[PDB]
Design a protein around this nucleic acid. Structure first.
Ligand SMILES: O=P(O)(O)O[C@H]1[C@H](OP(=O)(O)O)[C@@H](OP(=O)(O)O)[C@H](OP(=O)(O)O)[C@@H](OP(=O)(O)O)[C@H]1OP(=O)(O)O
Ligand SMILES: [Mg+2]
Length: 56
RNA sequence: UGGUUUCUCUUCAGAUCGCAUAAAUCUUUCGCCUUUUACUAAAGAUUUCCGUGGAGAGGAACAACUCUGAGUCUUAACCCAAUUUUUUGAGGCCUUGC
């Protein structure tokens, strides 16, 4: 925004440069994918296999 | 002495790259601090995921070929006659050695 709102261009909304935040949130997904695949796999495996009482 | 786009599989590659950058586990300190998660911010040890490269094999061509550029019997007209070279100052004779 400091580079965007420099001269005659004011301080309205008017700024879609979503590439930076887009990269930031996709690099979040890059690492959250194993964690959520493991967590959702255990969720589905407990729902369809049952809970093991004193197994571990 | 002479010819590649795409799909899959296998294998080997991360001591200067993937000129980009996430998460997790352990162990040790921490930092807050009702306890457990969920966390702070460092060191270390390890892993997973999104990507990548080299080689080989096979498939799908929707590219087109062999007097052709380069020959082991064709094909760069120029390495082809005045003192330094591929055109003789040559010619003649005689003695020595088993
Ligand atoms: O109000 P300020 O503290 O001056 O800052 C605001 C705020 O952004 P910050 O997060 O940097 O404060 C606004 O964001 P909101 O949280 O209010 O949504 C933003 O507007 P948008 O983010 O909605 O675009 C706006 O930007 P601007 O007013 O330039 O359009 C920006 O103002 P400043 O840039 O003047 O700080
Ligand atoms: Mg209790």
């Amino acid at each position: 925004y400091y580079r965007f709102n420099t001269g005659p261009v004011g301080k309205g909304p008017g700024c879609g440069f979503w590439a930076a935040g887009w990269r930031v949130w996709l690099f979040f997904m890059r690492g959250i994918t194993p964690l959520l695949e493991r967590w959702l796999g255990n969720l589905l495996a407990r729902q369809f296999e049952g809970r093991h009482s004193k197994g571990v």
